[PDB]
Protein backbone atom coordinates (compact mmCIF):
# COMPACT_ATOMS: atom_id res chain seq x y z
CA UNK A 1 0.00 0.00 0.00
CA UNK A 2 1.98 2.96 -1.33
CA UNK A 3 1.87 5.46 -4.20
CA UNK A 4 4.15 8.05 -5.80
CA UNK A 5 3.82 11.83 -6.04
CA UNK A 6 6.25 14.72 -6.54
CA UNK A 7 6.09 18.12 -8.24
CA UNK A 8 7.90 21.46 -8.00
CA UNK A 9 9.06 24.37 -10.16
CA UNK A 10 8.56 24.37 -13.92
CA UNK A 11 6.55 27.59 -14.09
CA UNK A 12 7.06 29.52 -10.86
CA UNK A 13 6.73 33.31 -11.02
CA UNK A 14 5.92 32.91 -14.72
CA UNK A 15 8.96 31.55 -16.56
CA UNK A 16 10.57 33.51 -19.43
CA UNK A 17 9.25 33.10 -22.96
CA UNK A 18 5.71 34.47 -22.71
CA UNK A 19 4.36 32.03 -25.30
CA UNK A 20 3.95 28.41 -24.22
CA UNK A 21 3.65 26.93 -27.71
CA UNK A 22 5.88 29.53 -29.36
CA UNK A 23 9.60 30.05 -28.80
CA UNK A 24 9.73 26.35 -27.96
CA UNK A 25 11.29 24.65 -30.98
CA UNK A 26 11.31 27.42 -33.58
CA UNK A 27 13.57 29.28 -31.17
CA UNK A 28 16.16 26.50 -31.21
CA UNK A 29 15.90 26.10 -34.98
CA UNK A 30 16.63 29.67 -36.09
CA UNK A 31 19.47 29.73 -33.56
CA UNK A 32 21.27 27.22 -35.78
CA UNK A 33 20.54 29.03 -39.04
CA UNK A 34 22.18 32.20 -37.73
CA UNK A 35 24.97 30.10 -36.23
CA UNK A 36 26.72 29.99 -39.61
CA UNK A 37 24.96 26.67 -40.22
CA UNK A 38 22.32 27.67 -42.77
CA UNK A 39 21.68 30.54 -45.18
CA UNK A 40 18.83 32.98 -44.55
CA UNK A 41 17.02 31.86 -47.70
CA UNK A 42 13.53 30.44 -48.35
CA UNK A 43 15.21 27.51 -50.09
CA UNK A 44 18.21 26.94 -47.82
CA UNK A 45 16.08 27.14 -44.69
CA UNK A 46 13.12 25.12 -45.96
CA UNK A 47 15.51 22.33 -46.93
CA UNK A 48 16.53 21.92 -43.29
CA UNK A 49 13.23 22.68 -41.55
CA UNK A 50 11.48 20.08 -43.71
CA UNK A 51 13.64 17.39 -42.10
CA UNK A 52 12.82 18.64 -38.60
CA UNK A 53 9.11 18.57 -39.44
CA UNK A 54 9.02 15.04 -40.85
CA UNK A 55 11.47 14.00 -38.13
CA UNK A 56 9.68 15.94 -35.39
CA UNK A 57 8.38 14.38 -32.18
CA UNK A 58 5.79 15.87 -29.83
CA UNK A 59 5.38 19.64 -29.62
CA UNK A 60 8.00 19.79 -32.37
CA UNK A 61 5.50 18.11 -34.69
CA UNK A 62 2.41 20.10 -33.71
CA UNK A 63 4.31 23.22 -34.77
CA UNK A 64 5.02 22.30 -38.39
CA UNK A 65 1.36 21.28 -38.60
CA UNK A 66 0.27 24.75 -37.50
CA UNK A 67 2.83 26.58 -39.63
CA UNK A 68 2.16 24.38 -42.64
CA UNK A 69 5.60 23.25 -43.79
CA UNK A 70 4.69 19.77 -45.03
CA UNK A 71 2.05 18.61 -47.51
CA UNK A 72 1.06 15.93 -44.99
CA UNK A 73 0.16 18.60 -42.43
CA UNK A 74 -2.56 20.99 -43.58
CA UNK A 75 -1.17 23.00 -46.50
CA UNK A 76 0.79 22.88 -49.75
CA UNK A 77 3.47 25.51 -49.17
CA UNK A 78 6.30 26.11 -46.71
CA UNK A 79 6.77 29.74 -47.73
CA UNK A 80 4.71 30.53 -44.63
CA UNK A 81 7.96 30.04 -42.72
CA UNK A 82 10.40 30.80 -45.54
CA UNK A 83 9.14 33.91 -47.33
CA UNK A 84 9.08 36.01 -44.13
CA UNK A 85 11.98 34.15 -42.51
CA UNK A 86 14.09 35.38 -45.42
CA UNK A 87 12.74 38.92 -45.08
CA UNK A 88 14.43 39.36 -41.70
CA UNK A 89 11.75 37.70 -39.57
CA UNK A 90 13.36 35.31 -37.05
CA UNK A 91 10.47 33.46 -35.42
CA UNK A 92 8.83 36.89 -35.26
CA UNK A 93 5.93 36.13 -37.60
CA UNK A 94 5.45 32.55 -36.41
CA UNK A 95 2.95 34.00 -33.93
CA UNK A 96 4.11 37.43 -32.77
CA UNK A 97 3.04 38.91 -36.11
CA UNK A 98 0.58 36.21 -37.18
CA UNK A 99 -1.36 37.17 -34.05
CA UNK A 100 -2.75 40.03 -36.15
CA UNK A 101 -4.95 37.39 -37.78
CA UNK A 102 -4.83 34.42 -35.41
CA UNK A 103 -3.96 35.11 -31.77
CA UNK A 104 -4.99 31.60 -30.71
CA UNK A 105 -1.79 30.43 -32.40
CA UNK A 106 0.14 31.18 -29.21
CA UNK A 107 -2.37 30.76 -26.38
CA UNK A 108 -4.52 28.11 -28.07
CA UNK A 109 -6.67 27.99 -24.93
CA UNK A 110 -10.13 27.89 -26.50
CA UNK A 111 -8.70 26.68 -29.81
CA UNK A 112 -10.63 24.25 -32.01
CA UNK A 113 -9.83 21.02 -30.16
CA UNK A 114 -11.39 17.63 -30.89
CA UNK A 115 -14.36 16.80 -28.66
CA UNK A 116 -13.45 13.20 -27.82
CA UNK A 117 -11.01 13.01 -24.91
CA UNK A 118 -9.66 15.31 -22.20
CA UNK A 119 -6.24 16.09 -23.66
CA UNK A 120 -6.00 15.53 -27.41
CA UNK A 121 -4.13 18.64 -28.59
CA UNK A 122 -3.25 20.07 -25.18
CA UNK A 123 -1.32 17.32 -23.39
CA UNK A 124 -0.11 15.29 -26.37
CA UNK A 125 1.43 12.44 -24.37
CA UNK A 126 0.77 8.98 -22.94
CA UNK A 127 -2.45 10.55 -21.65
CA UNK A 128 -3.71 11.77 -25.02
CA UNK A 129 -3.37 8.14 -26.10
CA UNK A 130 -4.56 6.56 -22.85
CA UNK A 131 -7.71 8.69 -22.90
CA UNK A 132 -8.55 8.57 -26.61
CA UNK A 133 -7.92 4.82 -26.72
CA UNK A 134 -10.33 4.11 -23.86
CA UNK A 135 -13.00 5.89 -25.91
CA UNK A 136 -12.68 3.27 -28.65
CA UNK A 137 -12.83 0.41 -26.16
CA UNK A 138 -9.88 -1.97 -26.15
CA UNK A 139 -8.14 -4.31 -23.70
CA UNK A 140 -6.12 -7.52 -23.40
CA UNK A 141 -5.67 -8.04 -19.66
CA UNK A 142 -2.67 -6.29 -18.13
CA UNK A 143 -1.58 -4.11 -21.05
CA UNK A 144 -1.33 -0.33 -21.39
CA UNK A 145 1.67 1.63 -22.67
CA UNK A 146 2.36 4.60 -24.94
CA UNK A 147 4.59 2.68 -27.35
CA UNK A 148 1.93 -0.03 -27.20
CA UNK A 149 -0.76 2.31 -28.51
CA UNK A 150 1.54 3.26 -31.38
CA UNK A 151 0.45 -0.01 -32.98
CA UNK A 152 -2.72 -0.93 -31.08
CA UNK A 153 -4.37 2.33 -32.12
CA UNK A 154 -2.51 2.82 -35.40
CA UNK A 155 -4.16 -0.34 -36.73
CA UNK A 156 -7.48 1.39 -36.01
CA UNK A 157 -6.48 4.89 -37.12
CA UNK A 158 -8.68 4.91 -40.25
CA UNK A 159 -11.28 2.98 -38.26
CA UNK A 160 -11.84 5.20 -35.22
CA UNK A 161 -10.43 8.25 -37.01
CA UNK A 162 -10.66 8.19 -40.83
CA UNK A 163 -10.79 11.96 -41.33
CA UNK A 164 -11.79 13.52 -44.66
CA UNK A 165 -14.31 10.68 -44.94
CA UNK A 166 -16.33 10.48 -41.73
CA UNK A 167 -16.83 14.25 -41.52
CA UNK A 168 -16.26 15.30 -45.13
CA UNK A 169 -17.41 12.81 -47.76
CA UNK A 170 -20.05 10.08 -47.87
CA UNK A 171 -22.36 11.80 -45.38
Curated annotation (Swiss-Prot):
Region listing for Interacts with ERN1, EIF2AK3 and ATF6, in residue ranges: 85-147
Region (Interacts with HSPA5): 118-161
Keyword line: Disulfide bond, Endoplasmic reticulum, Growth factor, Lipid-binding, Phosphoprotein, Sarcoplasmic reticulum, Secreted, Signal, Stress response, Unfolded protein response
Effect of residue 125 to E: Abolishes inhibition of HSPA5 ATP nucleotide exchange
Swiss-Prot/TrEMBL induction comment: Induced by endoplasmic reticulum (ER) stress. Induced in prorepair macrophages in response to muscle injury, expression peaks 3-4 days post-injury followed by progressive decline to day 10. Young mice (2-6 months of age) show a significantly greater induction of expression compared to older mice (22-25 months of age).
GO molecular-function terms, A-Z: growth factor activity; sulfatide binding
InterPro entries recorded: ARMET-like, ARMET_C, ARMET_N, SAP_dom_sf
Tissue: Strongly expressed in pancreatic islets and spermatocytes (at protein level). Expressed in chondrocytes in cartilage (at protein level). Expressed in prorepair macrophages in damaged skeletal muscles, expression decreases as animals age (at protein level).
Disulfides per UniProt: 19-106, 22-95, 53-64, 140-143
Record text on subunit structure and interactions: Interacts directly (via SAP domain) with HSPA5/BiP; the interaction inhibits ATP binding to HSPA5/BiP and subsequent nucleotide exchange. Component of a complex containing at least CRELD2, MANF, MATN3 and PDIA4. Interacts (via C-terminus) with ERN1 (via luminal domain); the interaction is decreased in the presence of increasing concentrations of Ca(2+).
Similarity annotation: Belongs to the ARMET family.
Protein name: Mesencephalic astrocyte-derived neurotrophic factor
Organism: Mus musculus
Gene coding for it: Manf
